[PDB]
């Protein structure tokens, strides 16, 4: 029931050495969006992940891509920092959350149903592993921190997801 996850090596992540850990199991799950390009192919989504990684490391000086996981409109999940490591994404809920980023801009378009589905089964996977508390809370990125955002179709959707807060 876990979704197939494209590992770092499978999307060609470059070599990192970020080794700051979350205290498992994690209470919160935050949902983000790249506010960028979408992608419908595994190879084209893989490129996008690499582009984002490079932006974060070369552009912003992060020690790795900032999100724990990314989701493509191809329906796939891509590993970033993964289950055990701490994001740079959301402040200061980085310290106790998994960040899941949908690759796209969702102000006038909705993510693909398979992209939505992969995220949910990813969350369910983490719970079943005990990476995430069974009674987790779910937030959009605007919910958690003091950041303004425009009307967004992704964040409308996550309201109907279980455990939304």
Residue numbers in the entry: 1 to 165
What does the paper say about this structure?
PGNs are normally recognized, and/or hydrolyzed (amidases EC 3.5.1.28) in some cases, by a class of PRRs, termed peptidoglycan recognition proteins (PGRPs).
The two disulfide bonds (Cys91-Cys214 and Cys128-Cys134) further stabilize the PGRP domain. Multiple-sequence alignment showed that BbtPGRP3 possess a highly conserved Gly-Tyr motif (Gly150-Tyr151) and an arginine residue Arg170, which are featured in the Group II PGRPs. Using HADDOCK server, we docked tracheal cytotoxin (TCT, GlcNAc-MurNAc(1,6-anhydro)-L-Ala-γ-D-Glu-meso-Dap-D-Ala) and muramyl pentapeptide (MPP, MurNAc-L-Ala-D-isoGln-L-Lys-D-Ala-D-Ala), which represent the DAP-type and Lys-type PGNs respectively, to the active-site valley of PGRP domain. The side-chain carboxylate of DAP forms a bidentate salt bridge with the guanidinium group of the conserved Arg170 docked TCT-complexed model, whereas residues Gly150 and Tyr151 interact with the side chain of L-Lys via van der Waals interactions in the MPP-complexed model. Compared to the individual PGRP domain, fusion of the CBD resulted in an approximately 500% augmentation of activity towards S. aureus PGNs, compared to a 50% increase towards E. coli PGNs. It indicated that CBD contributes to the hydrolytic activity towards PGNs (especially the Lys-type) of the PGRP domain.
